[PDB]
Structure 1
Amino acid sequence: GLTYSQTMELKDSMLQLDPNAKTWIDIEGRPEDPVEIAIYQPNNGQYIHFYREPTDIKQFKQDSKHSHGIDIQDLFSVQPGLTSAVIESLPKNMVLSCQGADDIRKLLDSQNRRDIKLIDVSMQKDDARKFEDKIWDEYKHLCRMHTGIVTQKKKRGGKEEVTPHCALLDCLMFEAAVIGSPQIPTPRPVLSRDLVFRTGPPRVVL
């Protein structure tokens, strides 16, 4: 769970959110077992983005091969408890936009945030990712967790490799698709890296 100072820091960082501004949300993993969450306000650029270790390792391994490409080893060092803490601190009656609402609706309801409203933009699968390449080009540095090769079924037979799905870059490219250009205000993380990850190994003296 979060320490006391960390909970305060999280609640304070989150108060940077405009409670009435357009806000995207996207998650990777099952709603009962999410592993990556992003909440992003395009008009000011602010985003909340963090990770979570899965409880069902065998579903995680299928999901990793087939949407997000995250290695279970890279999640060992993430801070626990962030998912329920962030969701509890979201402004009351916030209205969030998403591409495909069914899973996020279950996650929010499971956390007793039925007051949060979802707008499902529900773009066609290809249209939603029109700017995928451009968004990864410009913003790949914002998330390094997607290291595995990802393959997905083709609706007409067989499988194909796709770019891994990242909850943060999905928000960014969905906004780009809505406005018709990758011209968005610069995205800026609201959460400190030390809140997202536990203290890692010391730097190596070179």
Structure 2
Amino acid sequence: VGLSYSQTMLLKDLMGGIDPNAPTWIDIEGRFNDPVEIAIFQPQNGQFIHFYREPVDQKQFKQDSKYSHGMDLADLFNAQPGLTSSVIGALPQGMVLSCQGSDDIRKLLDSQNRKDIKLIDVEMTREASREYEDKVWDKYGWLCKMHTGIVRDKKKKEITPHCALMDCIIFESASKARLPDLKTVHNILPHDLIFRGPNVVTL
């Protein structure tokens, strides 16, 4: 379906937690046209938005699963449709978003008619990536148990998967030379908005 009216009213309220002037990270898995996991993280307060999307192109998903995110199609069948378009639509106006590699994000933001949003492509050395990847996945990896597959590189070497939320925390760590010390870190989105149990139908 899409987001229902009440779901959209809730979303409006939850997005009230997002500080529009706060420095903010964004990362996705999948392509701008077919993203399967979105994460928006505000390090200052530790608030983040994190959800999933079932892929349209099943073949590419499987390949993107074996070589980057390692996700499973079965875990995505219940993701609430409309979330990507509604969270990107609900983002405040003129928000400055930080990312790693602006190319994929800009295309998605543009295809959702959100050109008002400026992007900060932050550069990150592979050395700095290797440093915090393991530290982040240990302190904060309980937030996403969705990467249950083996990801290998061109050289068939098994590698740590990418998580978008974990990628955001890694990015913040590298940009700050300090893994963030955050007491409270939480998703503004409830589990019943991210996933779909009962059925609602639009007209």
Q: Distance in 2 between matches of 1:77 and 1:115?
A: 31
1:53-88, Cα deviation, whole Å (9 max, x unpaired)? 000000001000000000000101111110000001
Aligned-partner residue type, residue 94 of structure 1: M
Q: Distance in 2 between matches of 1:177 and 1:133?
A: 13
1:25-73, Cα deviation, whole Å (9 max, x unpaired)? 0000011100000000000000000000000000001000000000000
2:40 alignment counterpart: 39
Q: How does 1:152-171 map to 2 (within 5 A)?
A: 152-153=153-154, 158-171=155-168
Q: Distance in 1 between matches of 2:107 and 2:127?
A: 25
1:125 alignment counterpart: 126
Q: Distance in 2 between matches of 1:159 and 1:123?
A: 24
Q: Distance in 2 between matches of 1:167 and 1:15?
A: 22
2:188 alignment counterpart: 190
1:129 deviation in Å? 4.2
1:152 deviation in Å? 1.8
Q: Distance in 2 between matches of 1:129 and 1:193?
A: 31
1:68 alignment counterpart: 69
1:29 alignment counterpart: 30
2:17 alignment counterpart: 16
1:159 deviation in Å? 3.5
1:184 deviation in Å? 3.2
Q: Distance in 1 between matches of 2:121 and 2:181?
A: 20
4+ runs deviating over 4 angstroms: none
RMSD value, Cα: 1.2
Which residues of structure 1 form unaligned runs of 5+? Answer: 201-206
When the two structures are superposed, what TM-score results if normalisation uses the length of structure 2?
0.93
1:139 alignment counterpart: 140
Q: Distance in 1 between matches of 2:88 and 2:22?
A: 17
Q: Distance in 2 between matches of 1:189 and 1:128?
A: 24
Aligned-partner residue type, residue 23 of structure 1: T
